[PDB]
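Researcher: Next entry: Nucleoprotein (Human respiratory syncytial virus A).
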Amino acid sequence: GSGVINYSVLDLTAEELEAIKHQLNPKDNDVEL
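Model: Predicted structure:
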C-alpha cells in the first residue's frame, strides 16, 4: 500500500522540457511505465 506522489508542474523550463523529450541519460533502470 505504498503512497503516490503528486507531480503537477506547468511552468517548466525549456532546458528541462527538452531534456525529457530527448530522454538522454535516463534514471529508470528497472520497472518502467
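Model: Note for the record: Residues 17 and 32 are 19 Å apart (CA to CA).
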